[PDB]
Structures are given as structure tokens and as C-alpha cells.
Amino acid sequence: GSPSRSAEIMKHGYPGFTNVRTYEDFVLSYDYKTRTAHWVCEHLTPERLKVDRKLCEAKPDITFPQKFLSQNTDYKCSGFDRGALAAAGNHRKSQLAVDQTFYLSNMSPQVGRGFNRDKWNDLEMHCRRVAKKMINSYIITGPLYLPKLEGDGKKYIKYQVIGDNNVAVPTHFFKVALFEVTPGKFELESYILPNAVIEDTVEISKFHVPLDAVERSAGLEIFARLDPKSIVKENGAK
Amino acid sequence: HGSPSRSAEIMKHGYPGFTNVRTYEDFVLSYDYKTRTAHWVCEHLTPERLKHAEGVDRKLCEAKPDITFPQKFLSQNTDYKCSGFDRGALAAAGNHRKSQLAVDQTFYLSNMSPQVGRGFNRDKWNDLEMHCRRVAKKMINSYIITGPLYLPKLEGDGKKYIKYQVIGDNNVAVPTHFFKVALFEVTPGKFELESYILPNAVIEDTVEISKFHVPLDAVERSAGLEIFARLDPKSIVKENGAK
């Protein structure tokens, strides 16, 4: 007579089905190659946004094979923060839920000052703020590794890997948010931000992208279930 | 009557991963939407499967996209055309000799990776493929798993970076390396294992393929896969030429 929490979270489709773990309050797909997530999916409602982040010491999720885990020593002295894809601030409903965002499977190496602690946090705060006035909200977040044109006229994907376990440092991060403003009607916002120092004055809407750019770059199918006729607003328009 | 269906036969020793699985007539493939090439392919050979059926030829085969994957994740001939790289088949055409359809399917672009031509695809990597077929003729069953790798390199700032070119309008990944893992059943339930990693680069003809031996664990860590992961370790009598 009640849904599974994971069916509630994944109502609008799985971005992909690779190495999926269902936690107490979010769903994650893990990439054995990069040692960080392919994507995480979250479902917020006002009531669920109404515990501690302090009783939270990051650790590996050991239900993945040991040879494919990342560890604290990979992030230590690397210059990068442990950046949680499913934000701790989105899960205030029990200590277990929030603790689970501190699994290293939910972490990616992120620029600290100028990004994770700042602009990227502003994006996370923006989604909670909007979710509070919405009925249901669905958020997909993940790392990107994007090509750049180099001086030989060729395109290359280049990214750092850190630690003995070679954890990938994403070039960018995506976040797509689906907001249910009235029953069966949705606003859609898609963003791609660079994993780099972002000038604090830059508005988040500058990082708006077509949803197709996220999908094509990520190799994922986002909100596949959804009917395009149900979207009343995209990236702030219409 | 009980003789196994083809897919179950090929995958007897397990799926190395479960992502975007495509079962063809005579090989199984896992496709990577991100890189626009395979995660891995798996093949099964026997001495009888390595005898050419008359009238089957690579002559009438041409490369073509597998249009059963979503359009935004397809690679196209035009991505490879004039790119500086060959369409390198992971599941090799030469391993598939019993039917025209079987070999036609190795020409799907899902089974192709951009490979350096002279001194690799056409030379040293082909030497490895020939080796595996040579050994396979002497074995009861032979299982081969082949895939691309994207491996880091130390740079001047002392940090490690993965760097690879992406080609064409669809940004198909050019792997830095390729792995091949072969499991040869020498006597019933008794297996020899051979693992290799070669760079996607010009390799001198005089280098023996054995120089590219690497531990199976090395392959799995780099590939992010679990290869021949249901084997009883007792069943393995030889690894990379030793035991």
C-alpha cells in the first residue's frame, strides 16, 4: 500500500543500469573504471526537506568488489575535496540516510574553493530552495569527462587520476532537476559546470545546457519515461 | 538434443560486466554509450569452429552501425573516415568462419575501436589474434575476452592523467591500450590462461607478444571488469606460459 523508496525515487526512469546500489534515500550507479559514480538519483518533497553531518566520517562502500573501490588515501593530499554527488543536505530524514552520502562511491574529486564549497554548493542550494515550493522534485547528478580542442586541431579527453587506485577527476559535473509544479506538470533544468574555480559572481543559469548535451556526453538516458508534453518550462523558458 | 544454445555456450564462464549487452550470432558484446565502442566482447572457439566453411568470405562484408542502440550513442563510418585510425574489430572477423551472418556481424561498428593501422591492427595486434587461433586449434574449448583500455600516464607536474583523442562528429574514443584475455581448456575442466595488454600505437614487428603479458588482476583493475570470475582457481594449470 506504499511504494518502495527506490521505486519512488526512480519513478521517471533509470539513467542506466550499471552497478546500481539502492541506499536508504538515494540510488547510485557506480563506475568501476573511474572509481566514482556514473550517476546518482534523488527524490525530494517539501515534507522530506523539513540528524547530523558531523557524525559522518567518509568510508568505502564495501559491497562493491575491493579492487574497484576508492579510499580516503586517494583523496588525501591530492588538492581535491571529497565531493558528494548526492548532497548530505538533501537527506535529513535519519542519520542512516545522511551517513550514506559519505560512502566514497558517492564521492568524486572536486575543486574545493571556488567550486564544491561555493558555486556548486549554490547549485545544490538552488535545487532545495526550488524543491520546497514543488510537489515532487527529481535530481540526477554525475561526473563528465569532456573533450577539448588542442593545438594540433584534434580533440582530446584529458583528466587527472589520483591515488594508488587512480580515481578519476571529472572535467565537469552535470545536474538535471525535474520539478513537479502542479500534478503531472514539470519544469526541467539541466546544468553542466566545470570542475574548476568558478568566479562567485557567475549566475548558475549561465551553465544551462540542453538535456541532450548531458545525455550525449554522459552516455545516459535521463527521464526516459517522461512525456515531453508534460514539461511546461525548460531551463527557465516557457 | 542437449547441445547448448549458442549464447549460453559462449558465456559459459561468465559475463565480465552487464552493461548494454548485445548478443550477436557468434559473439557477445557489451557496448559503452560514453566512448561509442565496446566495453568488452566475448568469443568461444573450438578446433571445428576454426575450420572455414566453404563459400563464406570476408569479401562481401562492409562496416555498418548497429542501429539497435539509440541514435545519439552510435558511431558511424564517417567518424572513422579520414581520422587516422582503422576500424579495428575487437571480435575478430577471422574467429568467425562457420557462417556468412556470423562474420558479417563482426563488422558492426559497435564491435569496432579506433586502432593504429600500420604496426598495430595490421601487424602486432593481428599477430596476437593469430596466436590465439593457433593455440585454440590445440584445445577443447577456448574463450577470449577483448576490450579497450584508457590508462593514465605520469606527466611533468608529477601528476597522472588519462588522455585520449576522440574522433569524428560523434566523438568516438581512441583507446590508449587494448587487453585480451584467453582461457584455453587443455583437458576437461583444466585451463591455461593468457592475458595481454598492448598499447594502441606502432609496435616494432620484432617484439614478441609475450612481452605484453600482464597478470589477470592487472587487466581487471584497468578495465573495471571481472574476467573469468567464476573459475575454480584449482582448475588453472598454467598462466602466461608458466606452471
3-state secondary structure B99-139: CHHHHHHCCEHHHEEEECHHHHHCCHHHHHHHHHHHHHCCC
Answer for the pair B93, B58: CB distance below 8 angstroms, yes or no. Answer: yes
- Distance, in Å, from the CA atom of A187 to the CA atom of A178, rounded to the nearest integer, reads 6
State phi, psi for A79 to the nearest 5 degrees.
90, -5
Whether the CB of A164 is below 8 Å from some CB of chain B: the reply is no
Q: How many residues does chain B have?
A: 243
Q: Is A19 exposed, middle or buried (0-12, 13-18, 19+ CB in 10 A)?
A: buried
Strand A172-182 to A20-22 pairing: unpaired
Selection from A178, A179, A214, A177 nearest residue A193 by Cα = A214
Answer for the pair A109, A83: CB distance below 8 angstroms, yes or no. Answer: yes
Three-state secondary structure call for residue B95? helix
For residue B215 the three cell numbers come to 597478470
Answer for the pair A180, A8: CB distance below 8 angstroms, yes or no. Answer: no
B128: left (phi over 0), alpha (psi -120 to 50) or beta: alpha
Whether the CB of B153 is below 8 Å from some CB of chain A: the reply is no
Interface test with B, best of A38, A144, A155 (most B CBs within 10 A): A155
Number of alpha carbons in the 13 Å side-chain half-sphere of residue B145: 26
Chain A CA closest to residue B19: A18
Whether the CB of B72 is below 8 Å from some CB of chain A: the reply is yes
Number of domains in chain B: 1
Radius of gyration, CA atoms only, chain B: 18
Interface test with B, best of A38, A77, A156, A160 (most B CBs within 10 A): A160
Helix (H), strand (E) at residue A86: none
Distances (CA, A) of A123 to A126, A193, B197: 5, 10, 42
Radius of gyration, CA atoms only, chain A: 17
For residue A130 the three cell numbers come to 526550488
Within A80-171, strands assigned E span: 81-84, 107-110, 136-144, 148-149, 155-162, 167-168
- Distance, in Å, from the CA atom of A106 to the CA atom of A100, rounded to the nearest integer, reads 8
Contacts of B73 in chain A (CB under 8 A): 216, 219
Give the resolution to one decimal, in Å: 1.9
Subunit contact A218:B171, Cβ cutoff 8 A:
no
Whether the CB of A33 is below 8 Å from some CB of chain B: the reply is yes
Residue-number span of the structural domain to which B55 is assigned:
1-243
- Distance, in Å, from the CA atom of A228 to the CA atom of A111, rounded to the nearest integer, reads 35
Three-state secondary structure call for residue A69? coil
For residue B226 the three cell numbers come to 571481472
The domain spanning residue B213 has which CATH number?
3.40.570.10
Contacts of B70 in chain A (CB under 8 A): 221
Within A23-135, strands assigned E span: 27-31, 36-44, 81-84, 107-110
Interface test with B, best of A17, A66, A67, A161 (most B CBs within 10 A): A161
For residue B120 the three cell numbers come to 598495430
Contacts of B35 in chain A (CB under 8 A): 219
- Distance, in Å, from the CA atom of B242 to the CA atom of B239, rounded to the nearest integer, reads 5
The experimental method, as deposited, was X-ray
- Distance, in Å, from the CA atom of A145 to the CA atom of A149, rounded to the nearest integer, reads 13
Other beta carbons within 10 angstroms of residue A211's beta carbon come to 18
Whether the CB of B34 is below 8 Å from some CB of chain A: the reply is yes
Strand B160-167 to A155-162 pairing: antiparallel
